[model samples]
Target: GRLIYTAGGYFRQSLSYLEAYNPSNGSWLRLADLQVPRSGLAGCVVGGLLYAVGGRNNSPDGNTDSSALDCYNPMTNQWSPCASMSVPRNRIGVGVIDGHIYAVGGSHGCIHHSSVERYEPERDEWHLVAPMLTRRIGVGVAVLNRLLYAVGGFDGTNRLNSAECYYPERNEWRMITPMNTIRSGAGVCVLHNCIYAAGGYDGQDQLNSVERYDVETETWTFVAPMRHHRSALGITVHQGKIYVLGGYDGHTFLDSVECYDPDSDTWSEVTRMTSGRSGVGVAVTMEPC
Candidate 1:
């Protein structure tokens, strides 16, 4: 498995950049640029196609929050447009389950939102779905055991430690155990049937802390912290290892990359990105080549 990092922004600018990482050699290779520059977008792979969903444009006069949906073909190295989302959103939580991509809580322009939508690629359409229990932005979402988990995010007034799981069969989101630390702009992923919530902002500071949640016990336990305190980062799994990519640490935009080995409970540095970035979209997929 390989990880791909798509459009993101830093230094008051948005990006359309694309890069791929091969864990075999810890190398990053540049790829085609996105058709539209953006940040805070969600990336997911379904049926061998890479989808970059709604994100913010950050143009002075252009649309701030975007509803654009772009698809990438690893087989052809090209990007094409798809149906836009029903509402503009950025910093959203996204996941794929049973052939549908669910876009969860995010901000519309500057307003935090709880609306949820689903995309059916087979029909090239998006439809409204059950909304999240709480309005959120900068959320981390993933699927495990056929359930969608929406993790810590900002709720306008405070960073949240709250967590919830969505049952597609029931089309409802139910609150679950809360994280030990409040977080926004964190990265979440499932490994070994457990959810790992990585570095993010704790409302007042960038964080390097990591936590793992187990459904069996309904609890969160602290794990080894990342080397860099980060917020608005990208995370994905490749061959049982967790990789955390570019983000902001309150002082610098980070291009540094690190990976964690759960078997050893340790973090190690990988190759740095070509350019520093934050709010990047990341996804793991099989390379057609």
Candidate 2:
């Protein structure tokens, strides 16, 4: 049997496990740890490769300005180095389509980043792609029907709920429906036909709310609330369940884990993690090559 989805932490960052849940029996387990001890990175699983891109470290003031990149192989339980990102950033978003990893948006302390780049594992090369219309931090990336969507993030001055969609074939960014609430550091993942955006600090309060984006309608809708109101958490979907993992709520970090069933519209608490951390990357585990 595969691993069960449980709450786990990675390098002081909130992380989601690709195969951390056993939906059949409702249990959980920890699979792989990231290469870097940082948070605010983007993660994606494409062509059986698990990629974790640039992010910041938890410095004294909660930023690292890191540009380290790495890939994980669950078959070998090893981490391999990948091409360093062109720009150092944290709190970025990522997606995969047609065997390419699409990464966009993040922050470098004072400035929010807008540079977008893609990686081709076969050629071992990086290519510059289209940039977001607005620079942002903590943006979320998801791809559906061959199009990439970047959701809510913060500009240097204000938190943003507005979103944009990018057509890779055309290399363009177009505005879409803005989120009902402006948030940063929220966990985002695409499951079924909807994109789930959950839990992130809103400058004033930690949020328990969750939002969903419908690819067909190009509109945003509300979903069930998270079990806890915390930002910097990690969200992912595996098998048939949506798993929410570790994050901090400004005062303390957490290792709690929970799963939401869209069918029932309810959240069920699961086992706790061995470690407590916030701001890490999460993705599906890679099979043996």
Candidate 3:
């Protein structure tokens, strides 16, 4: 399986084609362009299907006015639209858990949101679910231990030091320990029981610091900092280690890629990407981690 991300026109951008990376051989190949060109989108994978949710137009000042939800199936090499979200959003949280897709906070015309939405594939519908206690954008969410966790995001005014989790059965959210530093746009993922939150901007500073949350203990802990500070990065578990892909570092956007191993508690380099983009979405097509 390779990397697949979206692209488009600057103002009314269409979704770009699939850009691939082979870890074993170290090569990249660009496939077909996406059916539409939309930016500021969010994506996740479920049962081998890649689901992409809302994003705004190409204007730099654009808001999430689009409610489009599209799904791509690698097995069938086809794409079909899915149930749209209740709120039009770009830069929301999108991920799968217990076979369901959940979307969290996003902005609409400079207005940050706190609402969360869930999509049930079986019924082909959307349901407004538990909203986050904090309204944030450029949010990073990960599911671990059958619980949904959202960490480090901006509330429009400043970066947030807050983090929390939602229990689906309880239909409630509980405040967990906040990150030591506030940030937005970091790449977040769960490797084992540890929730790794890495790379994002902190308003005044771009950060390379990587933080982790212990789900069982509900404690915040620090991990190794990345070689570079970045936001809008992509994180995924591939062949045991977590891979961090293209993002921006304030000074410039990135094509640099790296991998982190929990076993080593360290980071290492990987093949760089051909394109550099921030605020883009990434989804996996391979078997589950």
Candidate 4:
């Protein structure tokens, strides 16, 4: 069973909104509010729990060292604070592999980071892991073959196309072939053993372009472009399709959603969100939220 949830993000302002989509019934439901109003947070489900990680509070100070983690219990219909990461990184990359969650490079206000951290929920603790080779903000993270892949984002100076993968045991990152295009604020997910990176800003414009990486071949290739530019969108794979959710299109925050079928190499429309959301936190769970 597939149930999707999208937590806090900008709908023109920092929000505490939490919502769920039940594709089976083609319906969306509003859920408990996030205790903290935030934008650009990284979200993923670990062990039947939804974890909302670092995000911007819309404070001019762009503060770090504040609460940066929240766990949503589906049964309780509530969100509770978790151990903080000591870094309030926004637009950060998040992924789960081997039953653990990771926070990859993102920005602390004006500062871009290469630093990475791992969270072990059983202990309610987080600690720094090996940092990336290059600083990144708005990076895209995904897991394939148990290795965590960190994809393109801004480096404070340039939008990046370079990518890398981390081996948890060695705590090391291996450089991968560069993407054909540079992207920041992109959405990434794994399907059919391949990584699909879709929609983001290219420093100059909001992008509709999409790309794919094959773990076996170690190469990147182009795919069908999205029907619309989706800067800062969130995406996930469910029911054998890639669902690209709400984002900005350089003009407006978007509530639009689309799905891609790799077997057909085509993109199609799907149910839209109630309102626009950019820098959204999207996650999938086997159980309802």
Flag regions of model 2 displaced more than 4 Å.
Answer: 1-35, 59-63, 286-289
| Worst window of 10 by summed lDDT in candidate 2 | 1-10
TM value for model 2: 0.87
lDDT of 4 at 186: 93
Q: Each model's RMSD to truth, in Å?
A: 1.3, 3.3, 3.0, 1.7
Per-residue lDDT of model 3, residues 1-289, tens digit only? 5554333312224335456566777877555455655666777887777777776666445433556788876655566888788888776777687889888887787778899888888888889888889998888889987888888788878788788889999989888898888878788888888888998878888889998888778777888888878887877777677888777787676777788878788888887777666666676674222
Model 1, 123: alpha-carbon shift in Å?
0.6
TM-score of each: 0.96, 0.87, 0.90, 0.96
Q: What stretches of model 3 exceed 4 Å from their correct place?
A: 1-15, 59-64, 287-289
Candidate 1's residue-wise lDDT over 190-217, tens digit each?
9987999999898799999999999889
